[PDB]
Amino acid sequence: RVKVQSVETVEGCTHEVALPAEEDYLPLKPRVGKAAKEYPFILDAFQREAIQCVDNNQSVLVSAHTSAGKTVCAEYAIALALREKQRVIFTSPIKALSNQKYREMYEEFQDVGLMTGDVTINPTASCLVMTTEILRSMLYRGSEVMREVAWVIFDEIHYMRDSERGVVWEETIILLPDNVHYVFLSATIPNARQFAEWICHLHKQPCHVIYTDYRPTPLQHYIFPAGGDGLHLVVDENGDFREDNFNTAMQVLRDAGDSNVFKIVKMIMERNFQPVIIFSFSKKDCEAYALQMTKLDFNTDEEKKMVEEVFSNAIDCLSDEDKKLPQVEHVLPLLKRGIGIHHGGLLPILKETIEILFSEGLIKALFATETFAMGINMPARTVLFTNARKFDGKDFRWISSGEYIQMSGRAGRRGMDDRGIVILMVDEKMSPTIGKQLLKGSADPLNSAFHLTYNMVLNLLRVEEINPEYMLEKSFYQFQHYRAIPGVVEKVKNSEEQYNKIVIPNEESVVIYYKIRQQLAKLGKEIEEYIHKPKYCLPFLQPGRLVKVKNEGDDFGWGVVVNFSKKSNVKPNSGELDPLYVVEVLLRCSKESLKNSATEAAKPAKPDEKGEMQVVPVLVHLLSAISSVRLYIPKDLRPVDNRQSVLKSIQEVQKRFPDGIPLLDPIDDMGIQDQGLKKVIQKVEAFEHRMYSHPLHNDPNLETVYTLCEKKAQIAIDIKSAKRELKKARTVLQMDELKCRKRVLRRLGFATSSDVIEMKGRVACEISSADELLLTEMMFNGLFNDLSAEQATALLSCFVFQENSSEMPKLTEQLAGPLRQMQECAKRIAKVSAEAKLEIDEETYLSSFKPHLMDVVYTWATGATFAHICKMTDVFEGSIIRCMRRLEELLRQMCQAAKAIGNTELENKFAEGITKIKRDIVFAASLYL
Amino acid sequence: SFRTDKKPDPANWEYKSLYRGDIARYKRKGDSCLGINPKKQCISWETEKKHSRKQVERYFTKKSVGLMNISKTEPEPISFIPVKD
Numbered sequence A: 001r002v003k004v005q006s007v008e009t010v011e012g013c014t015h016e017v018a019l020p021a022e023e024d025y026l027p028l029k030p031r032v033g034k035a036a037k038e039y040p041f042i043l044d045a046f047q048r049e050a051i052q053c054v055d056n057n058q059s060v061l062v063s064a065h066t067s068a069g070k071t072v073c074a075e076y077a078i079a080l081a082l083r084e085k086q087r088v089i090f091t092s093p094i095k096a097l098s099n100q101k102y103r104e105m106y107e108e109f110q111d112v113g114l115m116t117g118d119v120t121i122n123p124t125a126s127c128l129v130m131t132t133e134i135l136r137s138m139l140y141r142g143s144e145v146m147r148e149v150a151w152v153i154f155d156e157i158h159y160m161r162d163s164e165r166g167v168v169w170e171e172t173i174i175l176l177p178d179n180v181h182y183v184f185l186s187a188t189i190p191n192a193r194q195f196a197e198w199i200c201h202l203h204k205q206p207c208h209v210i211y212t213d214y215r216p217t218p219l220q221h222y223i224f225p226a227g228g229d230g231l232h233l234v235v236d237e238n239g240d241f242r243e244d245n246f247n248t249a250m251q252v253l254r255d256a257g258d259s260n261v262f263k264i265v266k267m268i269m270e271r272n273f274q275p276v277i278i279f280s281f282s283k284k285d286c287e288a289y290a291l292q293m294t295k296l297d298f299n300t301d302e303e304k305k306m307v308e309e310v311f312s313n314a315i316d317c318l319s320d321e322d323k324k325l326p327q328v329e330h331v332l333p334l335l336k337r338g339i340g341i342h343h344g345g346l347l348p349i350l351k352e353t354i355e356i357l358f359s360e361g362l363i364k365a366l367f368a369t370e371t372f373a374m375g376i377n378m379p380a381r382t383v384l385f386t387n388a389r390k391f392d393g394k395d396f397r398w399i400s401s402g403e404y405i406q407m408s409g410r411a412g413r414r415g416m417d418d419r420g421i422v423i424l425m426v427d428e429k430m431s432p433t434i435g436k437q438l439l440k441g442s443a444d445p446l447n448s449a450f451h452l453t454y455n456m457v458l459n460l461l462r463v464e465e466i467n468p469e470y471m472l473e474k475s476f477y478q479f480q481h482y483r484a485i486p487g488v489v490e491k492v493k494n495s496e497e498q499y500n501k502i503v504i505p506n507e508e509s510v511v512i513y514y515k516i517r518q519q520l521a522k523l524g525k526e527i528e529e530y531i532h533k534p535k536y537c538l539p540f541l542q543p544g545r546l547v548k549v550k551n552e553g554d555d556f557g558w559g560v561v562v563n564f565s566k567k568s569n570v571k572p573n574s575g576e577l578d579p580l581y582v583v584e585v586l587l588r589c590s591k592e593s594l595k596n597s598a599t600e601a602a603k604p605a606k607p608d609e610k611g612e613m614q615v616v617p618v619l620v621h622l623l624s625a626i627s628s629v630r631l632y633i634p635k636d637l638r639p640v641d642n643r644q645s646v647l648k649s650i651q652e653v654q655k656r657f658p659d660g661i662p663l664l665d666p667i668d669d670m671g672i673q674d675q676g677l678k679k680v681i682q683k684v685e686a687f688e689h690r691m692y693s694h695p696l697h698n699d700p701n702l703e704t705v706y707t708l709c710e711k712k713a714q715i716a717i718d719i720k721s722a723k724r725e726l727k728k729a730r731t732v733l734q735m736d737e738l739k740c741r742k743r744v745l746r747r748l749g750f751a752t753s754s755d756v757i758e759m760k761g762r763v764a765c766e767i768s769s770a771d772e773l774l775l776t777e778m779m780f781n782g783l784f785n786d787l788s789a790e791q792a793t794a795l796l797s798c799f800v801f802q803e804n805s806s807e808m809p810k811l812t813e814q815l816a817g818p819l820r821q822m823q824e825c826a827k828r829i830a831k832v833s834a835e836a837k838l839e840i841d842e843e844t845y846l847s848s849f850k851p852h853l854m855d856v857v858y859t860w861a862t863g864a865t866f867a868h869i870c871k872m873t874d875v876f877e878g879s880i881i882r883c884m885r886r887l888e889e890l891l892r893q894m895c896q897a898a899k900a901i902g903n904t905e906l907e908n909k910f911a912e913g914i915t916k917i918k919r920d921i922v923f924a925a926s927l928y929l
Numbered sequence B: 001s002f003r004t005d006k007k008p009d010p011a012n013w014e015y016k017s018l019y020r021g022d023i024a025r026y027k028r029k030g031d032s033c034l035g036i037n038p039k040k041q042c043i044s045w046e047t048e049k050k051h052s053r054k055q056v057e058r059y060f061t062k063k064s065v066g067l068m069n070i071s072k073t074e075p076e077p078i079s080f081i082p083v084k085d
């Protein structure tokens, strides 16, 4: 019900407007009167177009690169809003982002406010800067602040695709009235028009997408190949890709040419590439590198004093006991020497301090974690990527175009640089097709991540003229599904043609052979399953035995057993249940694999590669083959060379048996007497008879024929799959889930059958920072009534601590008493959710709460100093602090809830819980505000 | 190197742990288990190096060289920028 018109513009800038279909497109109108705002600089073409949209009272989405100058459009709209005397609210995604914008907005326009969970300043300001999440609550409350608002600005709107907080952006947009106009600031996204159509469709008014690829300060990208003499220019200042350099850089990796980050950093200071941001994906790596830089000093003594006055000055607020912390103390020398680190783990008082320092020029090198790019933008002249590849947590991969685009977009300073330099350090061979995508590829599409939450549902039930269902229908998620339907149909037809084009396997009976081979593979896996049952395999797990390890698609080939142990489950989210059998096996792993400490990161060597032997413990079921061969193993495997020796031994047996290294028969040798395996063996034997009967096997060009059959089979699966996707075309995707949630809500007593919110439901609305359903139910079980004040807050740490820590600390009964108590309560909810047809598993829900910092929080609550609590746990300081900050956040969500159900005692226990918790460095605010 | 032994050692199963083996000294990869799938399971085999760690802290007390302070503003898109070893 929306059409798009394209409008002509000049300097490589695009203007399109999506309008409601029943309204005639009319060209924008030239300004009558003076400009609302005037700028120091001559505006860019993209800025002017957008400004004209605001002058003309229509919404615009501006999508341009970071530092292009998207921010001026918003400023002009505020200026217009203020000029007409109506209000405006500018929202930012993160608290950090908002503060920076608060200040930035404060300079230009006098009447400004900041609304964050933590701070509230000038709430009835003409221009109010708030975090978008706060805005959503404001919409739910039905508050007065929205009353004179004519324009809302969403800055960095492209973080809407983020999974956890993405929904709030969408939800906020839905809640806002049709009368309001928007300015959207975002980075360059491919589907910018699509977003604009949704706004028009939702708000029944025009939204303009103004898109430009302009970069005010151009960038020249380089790739340094490890072991290479120098950096190569892969992409130019003009955005072009130089393959010759890529290939040339790549060959050096082949070592057919004819890699410290220390070295890269040294040249940058030497060649006046000066401030540089070095990116590492590990917190530990960022720190490791930083130390290495300490050998060289990048600061003058005048600057050295400057670093210390500001540092010390920031730190003055901090309690002297907090000021004496090791975390604080050891950082200062680095700063003094021009080195900085910025990562998630570090303390916030220091984090901000380094950011301040970098802006002053005191910090020449910054080694920061990947989330620095997702931060208040501080640009640098050069950006260094220590690695081109990333670990997903499952598999290794290269960085995505969007990932590159964000990090490499930190390079180039508008006032200050003629060029921006981006450096990619690359340890693995990269293809031209793969490389071209990384550097010259597009950003991620802003695809929504709407999801249903109980708070969303409850609050919608609570509000008067809206329902939960209305939110779904009007969502972006739905819009995209509807809009993407034409493609699914097209894919089916095109796929259908493909099946026909390739439907020339020469004799149609090959499908039958393929099915026989497929059956064998299925059965073959069935045999293996019996062989790795612990009873049968433990007897053969002898050091030096040759074994094959395959783990869900990455198969390691041959390994040698080094040791075996039986371990018990210490999960302990769920019950202990069964004990796990772990075998430690020396496998041939990737060069990339060895670099990651984690057990999960092990991966098989690549085809090009030599490989390296590592002993990695694997579970019993991952061994696909066991062999007769046992080999000699040196007794210290620690050295590469000694571990390397097994690889040669393995090949010596491989060379010796080229018909395959021998395997133990399950019955003849393993002895597994399970009757069912014999049947599998018989069935495998039978198909082998069938397999040899077939003509195809003997025939020449069998492989060519079979491959077509595999190809043909693939399209059918895709055709079927697409057809399934098409079947859901006229359906609202998440509505079924809402109803399932709705049933759960009714059963649990939160709301009635006729969708009227109930008193239990009302309490739950307040809790938006955690699992509200459990907490109110826990409140209604009176669990909180008898708790220690410290226990009450410590128990809640599990509600908001999400980070992955290795393990919990055993707890005194006061802390773990409630821990026992919550899990049953959690277990009960889980029982009902399953009953209501939802997808969850009881072990998982129960183990989604982490008690790892339970002790620590209690200890902090009672009056312990921050320094003391750090000793207790291995999670980093920043992580600890973050959890506490959310803890205060949750307590306030909890405090309010108590008022709704009128327990004064509960309000005070929780409200005094904050006071024990909220003190000193943990709650400082130095990011200047 | 190699030999073929087809002979089972029942102790491992009966006693729950390895018997009849000479164990090497080795460092394993990490603290988990490869197979473990949902991480609905955790096991314990049962040493940080942070910035404020003592080994690290004495490196800063020990001084370092300063290479270049204040020639010109910067330098185009040159295809190869070298950097010595």
Ligand SMILES: Nc1ncnc2c1ncn2[C@@H]1O[C@H](COP(=O)(O)OP(=O)(O)OP(=O)(O)O)[C@@H](O)[C@H]1O
Pocket (backbone or CB within 6 Å): A041, A042, A043, A044, A065, A066, A067, A068, A069, A070, A071, A072, A155, A156, A185, A377, A414
């Ligand atoms: N025409 C211009 N001439 C000079 N400087 C400009 C111009 N337009 C913008 N700038 C400068 O551009 C810088 C970046 O603008 P802004 O911070 O709004 O960037 P952005 O990346 O578009 O937005 P965001 O803050 O949302 O990331 C500002 O310091 C601003 O002064």
Ligand SMILES: [Cl-]
Pocket (backbone or CB within 6 Å): A613, A614, A637, A638, A639, A640, A643, A644
């Ligand atoms: Cl080794």
